[PDB]
Design a protein around this motif. Structure first.
Motif, PDB file in Angstrom:
ATOM      1  N   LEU A  62       0.815   4.302   2.846  1.00  0.00           N
ATOM      2  CA  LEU A  62      -0.053   4.565   3.985  1.00  0.00           C
ATOM      3  C   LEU A  62      -1.153   3.468   4.009  1.00  0.00           C
ATOM      4  O   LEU A  62      -2.087   3.489   3.226  1.00  0.00           O
ATOM      5  CB  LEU A  62      -0.672   5.959   3.857  1.00  0.00           C
ATOM      6  CG  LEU A  62      -0.842   6.824   5.107  1.00  0.00           C
ATOM      7  CD1 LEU A  62      -0.689   6.033   6.395  1.00  0.00           C
ATOM      8  CD2 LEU A  62       0.166   7.949   5.068  1.00  0.00           C
ATOM      9  N   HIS A  63      -1.001   2.471   4.872  1.00  0.00           N
ATOM     10  CA  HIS A  63      -1.976   1.403   4.927  1.00  0.00           C
ATOM     11  C   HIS A  63      -3.078   1.795   5.922  1.00  0.00           C
ATOM     12  O   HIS A  63      -2.819   2.487   6.901  1.00  0.00           O
ATOM     13  CB  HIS A  63      -1.298   0.072   5.298  1.00  0.00           C
ATOM     14  CG  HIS A  63      -2.038  -1.132   4.802  1.00  0.00           C
ATOM     15  ND1 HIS A  63      -3.107  -1.680   5.480  1.00  0.00           N
ATOM     16  CD2 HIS A  63      -1.881  -1.879   3.686  1.00  0.00           C
ATOM     17  CE1 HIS A  63      -3.574  -2.712   4.809  1.00  0.00           C
ATOM     18  NE2 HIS A  63      -2.846  -2.859   3.717  1.00  0.00           N
ATOM     19  N   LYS A  64      -4.307   1.371   5.664  1.00  0.00           N
ATOM     20  CA  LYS A  64      -5.429   1.773   6.532  1.00  0.00           C
ATOM     21  C   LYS A  64      -5.473   1.029   7.863  1.00  0.00           C
ATOM     22  O   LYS A  64      -5.992   1.550   8.847  1.00  0.00           O
ATOM     23  CB  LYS A  64      -6.772   1.591   5.828  1.00  0.00           C
ATOM     24  CG  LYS A  64      -7.615   2.855   5.816  1.00  0.00           C
ATOM     25  CD  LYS A  64      -6.952   3.975   5.011  1.00  0.00           C
ATOM     26  CE  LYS A  64      -6.676   3.579   3.563  1.00  0.00           C
ATOM     27  NZ  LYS A  64      -6.218   4.764   2.779  1.00  0.00           N
ATOM     28  N   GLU A  65      -4.924  -0.184   7.892  1.00  0.00           N
ATOM     29  CA  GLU A  65      -5.173  -1.120   8.978  1.00  0.00           C
ATOM     30  C   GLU A  65      -4.036  -1.126   9.992  1.00  0.00           C
ATOM     31  O   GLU A  65      -4.053  -1.896  10.960  1.00  0.00           O
ATOM     32  CB  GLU A  65      -5.371  -2.521   8.403  1.00  0.00           C
ATOM     33  CG  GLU A  65      -6.554  -2.653   7.449  1.00  0.00           C
ATOM     34  CD  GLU A  65      -7.882  -2.603   8.185  1.00  0.00           C
ATOM     35  OE1 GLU A  65      -7.891  -2.904   9.408  1.00  0.00           O
ATOM     36  OE2 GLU A  65      -8.910  -2.256   7.547  1.00  0.00           O
ATOM     37  N   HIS A 104       1.456  -5.044  -0.498  1.00  0.00           N
ATOM     38  CA  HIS A 104       0.483  -4.126   0.094  1.00  0.00           C
ATOM     39  C   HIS A 104      -0.366  -4.782   1.223  1.00  0.00           C
ATOM     40  O   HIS A 104      -1.500  -4.336   1.519  1.00  0.00           O
ATOM     41  CB  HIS A 104      -0.437  -3.543  -0.999  1.00  0.00           C
ATOM     42  CG  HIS A 104       0.200  -2.467  -1.830  1.00  0.00           C
ATOM     43  ND1 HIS A 104      -0.523  -1.653  -2.676  1.00  0.00           N
ATOM     44  CD2 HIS A 104       1.490  -2.082  -1.963  1.00  0.00           C
ATOM     45  CE1 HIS A 104       0.280  -0.803  -3.274  1.00  0.00           C
ATOM     46  NE2 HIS A 104       1.508  -1.046  -2.867  1.00  0.00           N
ATOM     47  N   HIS A 111      -4.869  13.725   0.486  1.00  0.00           N
ATOM     48  CA  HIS A 111      -4.720  13.860   1.926  1.00  0.00           C
ATOM     49  C   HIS A 111      -4.161  15.233   2.301  1.00  0.00           C
ATOM     50  O   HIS A 111      -3.774  15.463   3.455  1.00  0.00           O
ATOM     51  CB  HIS A 111      -3.752  12.798   2.466  1.00  0.00           C
ATOM     52  CG  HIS A 111      -4.257  11.385   2.381  1.00  0.00           C
ATOM     53  ND1 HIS A 111      -3.580  10.329   2.966  1.00  0.00           N
ATOM     54  CD2 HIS A 111      -5.373  10.850   1.820  1.00  0.00           C
ATOM     55  CE1 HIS A 111      -4.242   9.201   2.742  1.00  0.00           C
ATOM     56  NE2 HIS A 111      -5.336   9.486   2.057  1.00  0.00           N
ATOM     57  N   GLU A 156      -4.492   7.759  -1.896  1.00  0.00           N
ATOM     58  CA  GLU A 156      -5.870   7.217  -1.862  1.00  0.00           C
ATOM     59  C   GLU A 156      -6.071   6.186  -2.944  1.00  0.00           C
ATOM     60  O   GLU A 156      -5.995   5.006  -2.685  1.00  0.00           O
ATOM     61  CB  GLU A 156      -6.949   8.322  -2.021  1.00  0.00           C
ATOM     62  CG  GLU A 156      -7.377   8.995  -0.737  1.00  0.00           C
ATOM     63  CD  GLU A 156      -7.951   8.019   0.289  1.00  0.00           C
ATOM     64  OE1 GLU A 156      -8.941   7.308  -0.052  1.00  0.00           O
ATOM     65  OE2 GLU A 156      -7.403   7.980   1.427  1.00  0.00           O
ATOM     66  N   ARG A 157      -6.379   6.642  -4.153  1.00  0.00           N
ATOM     67  CA  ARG A 157      -6.644   5.756  -5.270  1.00  0.00           C
ATOM     68  C   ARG A 157      -5.670   6.094  -6.385  1.00  0.00           C
ATOM     69  O   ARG A 157      -5.602   7.247  -6.845  1.00  0.00           O
ATOM     70  CB  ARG A 157      -8.088   5.879  -5.760  1.00  0.00           C
ATOM     71  CG  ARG A 157      -8.504   4.705  -6.637  1.00  0.00           C
ATOM     72  CD  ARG A 157     -10.016   4.492  -6.677  1.00  0.00           C
ATOM     73  NE  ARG A 157     -10.562   4.082  -5.385  1.00  0.00           N
ATOM     74  CZ  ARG A 157     -11.849   3.840  -5.139  1.00  0.00           C
ATOM     75  NH1 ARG A 157     -12.760   3.952  -6.102  1.00  0.00           N
ATOM     76  NH2 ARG A 157     -12.229   3.478  -3.918  1.00  0.00           N
TER      77      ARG A 157
END
Length: 326
Positions: free
Chosen positions: A106-109, A295, A76, A160-161
């Protein structure tokens, strides 16, 4: 090979007094915790405010506090990181090291608070320091070569991953700095006689890492043979606490059984990994299985189980008191 420090059992009366959790204790821990119950995204303003709070809290208790800041590239982009390292007696050769991370995923939703992961474990460390402070300042006066050190890693979580490059930003950095920083027994207060100290990392006697705590019915196992002698003290302490009737359970005549007196492996890669490659003994206080909420966006305050937290605080207080002979 035996453990290098003689393993001497907590006095019964301390066992009882550590097994207490008064109304003030509950209040204090919860008021500590509320400061953490915000998203702590690396580089954010709230994240910074959380860090400042940890630092002010330990300096207010006359710990030596270090803010270890650096920049690192991530998927990022560039990010600032600050590890926090607090040490009761700097000049003491050996450290009992307790550790967690204060950054949140950092959650996406949406907004992820990260209550078990690792808001609570951060509260636990500060709570221990505040509640055992008088004794810790007394232990320090001995000058007998052992102190307590708290690390609050930054950037543990992958952006990220999860990979070797995307995770453990804080640990990888500190493990490395400290390995490269040379020292020796003669530069340090009261090293044990068998000691072979070539650098700062050698001065970490055992690293106890706390993660994913605050949910109902955790189950821990010993994940490392090297540290079984220390892990056993957790099992024994939980047991004495139950015997004494100081665990909080749903009905009378129940017993907790968090620390299974057996082991497995997992190798749940974590903040311990870079220290482990440079021979630092490790106890990872992480449950198997991971909680419900791991998570998810529901890793929040409403899902924290206060009776379990109280019990764990009891065990940790007692554990630290036994290792350091408070």
């Amino acid at each position: 090979l035996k453990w290098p420090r003689d393993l001497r059992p907590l006095a019964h009366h301390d066992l009882l007094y550590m097994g207490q959790i008064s109304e003030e204790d509950r209040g204090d821990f919860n008021a500590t915790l509320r400061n953490f119950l915000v998203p702590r995204v690396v580089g954010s303003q709230k994240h910074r405010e959380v860090r400042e709070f940890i630092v002010r809290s330990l300096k207010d208790l006359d710990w030596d506090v270090e803010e270890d800041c650096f920049d690192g590239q991530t998927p990022h982009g560039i990010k600032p990181f600050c590890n926090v390292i607090a040490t009761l007696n700097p000049s003491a050769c050996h450290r009992l090291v307790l550790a967690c991370h204060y950054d949140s995923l950092l959650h996406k939703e949406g907004t992820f608070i990260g209550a078990t992961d690792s808001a609570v474990p951060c509260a636990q460390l500060l709570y221990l320091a505040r509640s055992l402070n008088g004794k810790l300042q007394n232990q320090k006066t001995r000058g007998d070569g052992l102190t307590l050190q708290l690390v609050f890693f930054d950037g543990e979580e992958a952006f990220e991953r999860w990979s070797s490059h995307d995770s453990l930003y804080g640990s990888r950095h500190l493990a490395q700095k400290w390995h490269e920083d040379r020292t020796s027994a003669e530069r340090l207060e009261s090293c044990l006689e068998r000691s072979e100290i070539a650098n700062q990392i050698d001065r970490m006697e055992v690293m106890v890492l706390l993660d994913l705590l605050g949910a109902e019915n955790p189950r821990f196992y010993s994940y490392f043979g090297e540290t079984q002698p220390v892990y056993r003290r957790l099992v024994n302490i939980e047991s004495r606490l139950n015997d004494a009737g100081l665990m909080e359970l749903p009905r009378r005549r129940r017993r907790t059984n968090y620390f299974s007196n057996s082991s497995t492996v997992g190798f749940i890669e974590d903040d311990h990994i870079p220290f482990l490659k440079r021979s630092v003994p490790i106890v990872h206080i992480i449950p198997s299985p991971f909680p419900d909420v791991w998570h998810t966006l529901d890793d929040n305050e409403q899902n924290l189980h206060h009776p379990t937290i109280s019990n764990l605080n009891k065990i940790f207080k007692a554990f630290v008191s036994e290792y350091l002979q408070l």
